[PDB]
Design a protein around this motif. Structure first.
Motif, PDB file in Angstrom:
ATOM      1  N   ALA A  27       0.839  -1.187   0.000  1.00  0.00           N
ATOM      2  CA  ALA A  27       0.000   0.000   0.000  1.00  0.00           C
ATOM      3  C   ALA A  27       0.880   1.245   0.000  1.00  0.00           C
ATOM      4  O   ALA A  27       1.764   1.373   0.842  1.00  0.00           O
ATOM      5  CB  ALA A  27      -0.909   0.014   1.203  1.00  0.00           C
ATOM      6  N   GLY A  28       0.632   2.140  -0.960  1.00  0.00           N
ATOM      7  CA  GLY A  28       1.315   3.421  -1.031  1.00  0.00           C
ATOM      8  C   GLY A  28       2.665   3.368  -1.748  1.00  0.00           C
ATOM      9  O   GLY A  28       3.384   4.364  -1.784  1.00  0.00           O
ATOM     10  N   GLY A  29       3.006   2.197  -2.300  1.00  0.00           N
ATOM     11  CA  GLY A  29       4.318   1.982  -2.886  1.00  0.00           C
ATOM     12  C   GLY A  29       4.250   1.196  -4.190  1.00  0.00           C
ATOM     13  O   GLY A  29       3.198   0.692  -4.559  1.00  0.00           O
ATOM     14  N   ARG A  52      -0.604  -1.546  -8.608  1.00  0.00           N
ATOM     15  CA  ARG A  52      -1.930  -1.301  -8.074  1.00  0.00           C
ATOM     16  C   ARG A  52      -3.052  -1.384  -9.108  1.00  0.00           C
ATOM     17  O   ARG A  52      -2.913  -0.873 -10.213  1.00  0.00           O
ATOM     18  CB  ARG A  52      -1.895   0.097  -7.466  1.00  0.00           C
ATOM     19  CG  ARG A  52      -3.178   0.550  -6.917  1.00  0.00           C
ATOM     20  CD  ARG A  52      -3.012   1.851  -6.206  1.00  0.00           C
ATOM     21  NE  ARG A  52      -4.251   2.148  -5.513  1.00  0.00           N
ATOM     22  CZ  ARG A  52      -5.415   2.301  -6.118  1.00  0.00           C
ATOM     23  NH1 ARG A  52      -5.486   2.596  -7.405  1.00  0.00           N
ATOM     24  NH2 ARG A  52      -6.533   2.188  -5.409  1.00  0.00           N
ATOM     25  N   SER A  83       3.667  -6.843   3.124  1.00  0.00           N
ATOM     26  CA  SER A  83       2.611  -5.930   3.528  1.00  0.00           C
ATOM     27  C   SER A  83       1.365  -6.311   2.724  1.00  0.00           C
ATOM     28  O   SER A  83       1.089  -7.503   2.571  1.00  0.00           O
ATOM     29  CB  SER A  83       3.086  -4.483   3.362  1.00  0.00           C
ATOM     30  OG  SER A  83       2.560  -3.562   4.319  1.00  0.00           O
ATOM     31  N   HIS A 181      -1.069  10.095  -2.789  1.00  0.00           N
ATOM     32  CA  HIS A 181      -0.217   9.201  -2.018  1.00  0.00           C
ATOM     33  C   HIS A 181      -0.932   8.783  -0.734  1.00  0.00           C
ATOM     34  O   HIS A 181      -0.905   7.604  -0.370  1.00  0.00           O
ATOM     35  CB  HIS A 181       1.163   9.778  -1.674  1.00  0.00           C
ATOM     36  CG  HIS A 181       1.971   8.797  -0.867  1.00  0.00           C
ATOM     37  ND1 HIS A 181       2.118   8.879   0.504  1.00  0.00           N
ATOM     38  CD2 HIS A 181       2.584   7.655  -1.226  1.00  0.00           C
ATOM     39  CE1 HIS A 181       2.822   7.844   0.944  1.00  0.00           C
ATOM     40  NE2 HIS A 181       3.119   7.085  -0.092  1.00  0.00           N
ATOM     41  N   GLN A 182      -1.561   9.749  -0.045  1.00  0.00           N
ATOM     42  CA  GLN A 182      -2.185   9.468   1.243  1.00  0.00           C
ATOM     43  C   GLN A 182      -3.423   8.600   1.069  1.00  0.00           C
ATOM     44  O   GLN A 182      -3.643   7.639   1.811  1.00  0.00           O
ATOM     45  CB  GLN A 182      -2.585  10.760   1.953  1.00  0.00           C
ATOM     46  CG  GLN A 182      -1.390  11.571   2.440  1.00  0.00           C
ATOM     47  CD  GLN A 182      -0.574  10.794   3.432  1.00  0.00           C
ATOM     48  OE1 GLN A 182      -1.099  10.335   4.440  1.00  0.00           O
ATOM     49  NE2 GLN A 182       0.727  10.629   3.184  1.00  0.00           N
ATOM     50  N   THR A 184      -4.341   6.528  -1.486  1.00  0.00           N
ATOM     51  CA  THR A 184      -4.180   5.150  -1.931  1.00  0.00           C
ATOM     52  C   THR A 184      -3.531   4.308  -0.841  1.00  0.00           C
ATOM     53  O   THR A 184      -3.934   3.166  -0.631  1.00  0.00           O
ATOM     54  CB  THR A 184      -3.400   5.037  -3.245  1.00  0.00           C
ATOM     55  OG1 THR A 184      -2.081   5.542  -3.073  1.00  0.00           O
ATOM     56  CG2 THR A 184      -4.083   5.758  -4.362  1.00  0.00           C
ATOM     57  N   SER A 185      -2.537   4.885  -0.151  1.00  0.00           N
ATOM     58  CA  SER A 185      -1.918   4.224   0.985  1.00  0.00           C
ATOM     59  C   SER A 185      -2.973   3.836   2.018  1.00  0.00           C
ATOM     60  O   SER A 185      -3.000   2.702   2.484  1.00  0.00           O
ATOM     61  CB  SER A 185      -0.857   5.119   1.615  1.00  0.00           C
ATOM     62  OG  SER A 185      -0.377   4.587   2.838  1.00  0.00           O
ATOM     63  N   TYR A 186      -3.845   4.791   2.367  1.00  0.00           N
ATOM     64  CA  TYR A 186      -4.895   4.536   3.336  1.00  0.00           C
ATOM     65  C   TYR A 186      -5.869   3.460   2.848  1.00  0.00           C
ATOM     66  O   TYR A 186      -6.103   2.477   3.544  1.00  0.00           O
ATOM     67  CB  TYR A 186      -5.661   5.825   3.699  1.00  0.00           C
ATOM     68  CG  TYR A 186      -6.756   5.530   4.696  1.00  0.00           C
ATOM     69  CD1 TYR A 186      -6.471   5.367   6.040  1.00  0.00           C
ATOM     70  CD2 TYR A 186      -8.063   5.320   4.282  1.00  0.00           C
ATOM     71  CE1 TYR A 186      -7.470   5.058   6.963  1.00  0.00           C
ATOM     72  CE2 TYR A 186      -9.069   5.006   5.189  1.00  0.00           C
ATOM     73  CZ  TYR A 186      -8.767   4.868   6.534  1.00  0.00           C
ATOM     74  OH  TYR A 186      -9.741   4.538   7.444  1.00  0.00           O
ATOM     75  N   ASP A 188      -5.740   1.292   0.272  1.00  0.00           N
ATOM     76  CA  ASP A 188      -5.183  -0.002  -0.095  1.00  0.00           C
ATOM     77  C   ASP A 188      -4.901  -0.848   1.145  1.00  0.00           C
ATOM     78  O   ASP A 188      -5.120  -2.060   1.110  1.00  0.00           O
ATOM     79  CB  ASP A 188      -3.946   0.134  -0.973  1.00  0.00           C
ATOM     80  CG  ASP A 188      -4.228   0.451  -2.423  1.00  0.00           C
ATOM     81  OD1 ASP A 188      -5.417   0.509  -2.802  1.00  0.00           O
ATOM     82  OD2 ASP A 188      -3.259   0.622  -3.191  1.00  0.00           O
ATOM     83  N   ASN A 189      -4.455  -0.211   2.241  1.00  0.00           N
ATOM     84  CA  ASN A 189      -4.315  -0.925   3.508  1.00  0.00           C
ATOM     85  C   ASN A 189      -5.648  -1.318   4.141  1.00  0.00           C
ATOM     86  O   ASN A 189      -5.747  -2.402   4.702  1.00  0.00           O
ATOM     87  CB  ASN A 189      -3.460  -0.155   4.515  1.00  0.00           C
ATOM     88  CG  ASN A 189      -1.983  -0.404   4.303  1.00  0.00           C
ATOM     89  OD1 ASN A 189      -1.555  -1.538   4.103  1.00  0.00           O
ATOM     90  ND2 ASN A 189      -1.180   0.629   4.336  1.00  0.00           N
TER      91      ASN A 189
END
Ligand SMILES: COc1ccc(OC)c(-c2ccc(-c3cn(CCc4ccc(C(=O)N(C)C)cc4)nn3)cn2)c1
Length: 276
Positions: A27-29, A52, A83, A181-182, A184-186, A188-189
């Protein structure tokens, strides 16, 4: 080098060659995070990264699995992820097995279940955003009493959209790049919380860190506690754990990834020997 959602980290030979390692993004990467691991794997080991795509975990694997088969056909399949990437790898292993494909290795780099289930309730949505709201106060200045009534009937995407819209209309303009960034990271997790994990009939190695790093715990407190098997025991009969120590966040980097790579190299070596 990038073809749709497939990143080539090391291209396989034109014909023949070693069994590719398919890695899946965190997530986020991007799957560039697997370059250190690649450096610790046998020379000329192909590696392709799956980047993604949208949907539930299951819907993501529904897009990945056809591409995997296009690339590798009957197998052998080697699936690896850190992850979120671990959950995606496993989800692909499930789908490949349903299609009769030969999955020989699933490598989970500290993809570890929360110590307790994340409730999918209005109460939990309320509690989560109250926590986040309190943290946001210390950040970019008194939040008005969260309109829970709209919030609690939305999925994670809609929750974030509703909150981003509240922020936007309140005056703060966030650069789209930061939003992305924030966001998709949020999301996707969060997609992990409702993953429909099925039992798997093959070999899984879980590379087991000691603990989740603090930021993951702040995102979701239930990551504060983990079980020795990372929750995988009830799903995976043929489960091997390789303890690697340290925190989740460090598991993907040197020097810890050397321990992952050294072990995974032996597994790959055995797969290559068997192909005679
Ligand atoms: C729901 O049903 C099931 C059934 C079985 C399962 O496993 C046996 C699991 C399961 C599996 C794997 C994971 C998992 C979570 N993560 C990374 C989490 C993270 C990483 C960085 C961050 C961060 O630092 N920020 C800033 C967001 C925040 C959270 N990896 N694997 C969770 N649940 C779920």
């Amino acid at each position: 080098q990038i073809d749709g959602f497939v990143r080539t980290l090391r291209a396989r030979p034109e014909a023949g060659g070693k069994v590719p390692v398919f890695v899946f993004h965190p997530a986020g990467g991007s799957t560039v995070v697997y370059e250190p691991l690649l450096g610790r794997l046998p020379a000329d080991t192909p590696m392709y990264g799956f980047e993604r795509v949208e949907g539930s975990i299951e819907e993501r694997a529904q897009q990945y699995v056809p591409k995997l088969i296009e690339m590798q056909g009957d197998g052998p399949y080697v699936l690896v992820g850190w992850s979120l990437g671990g959950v995606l790898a496993y989800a692909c292993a499930i789908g490949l097995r349903r299609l009769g494909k030969d999955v020989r290795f699933v490598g989970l780099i500290d993809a570890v279940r929360a110590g307790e289930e994340i409730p999918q309730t209005k109460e939990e949505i309320r509690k989560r955003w109250d926590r986040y709201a309190a943290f946001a106060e210390k950040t970019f200045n008194t939040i008005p009493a969260i309109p829970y009534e709209q919030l609690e009937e939305l999925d994670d995407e809609g929750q974030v959209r509703f909150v981003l819209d509240a922020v936007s209309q309140s005056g703060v303009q966030i650069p789209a790049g930061i939003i992305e960034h924030q966001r998709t990271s949020y999301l996707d997790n969060r997609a992990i919380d409702t993953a429909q994990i099925q039992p798997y009939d093959g070999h899984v190695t879980l590379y087991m860190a000691d603990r989740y790093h603090d930021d993951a715990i702040m995102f979701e407190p239930r990551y504060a506690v983990r079980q020795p098997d990372g929750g995988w025991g009830e799903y995976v009969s043929d489960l091997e754990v390789v303890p690697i120590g340290g925190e989740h966040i460090q598991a993907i980097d040197e020097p810890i990834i050397a321990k992952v790579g050294e072990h995974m190299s032996r597994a790959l070596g055995q797969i290559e020997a068997d192909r005679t």
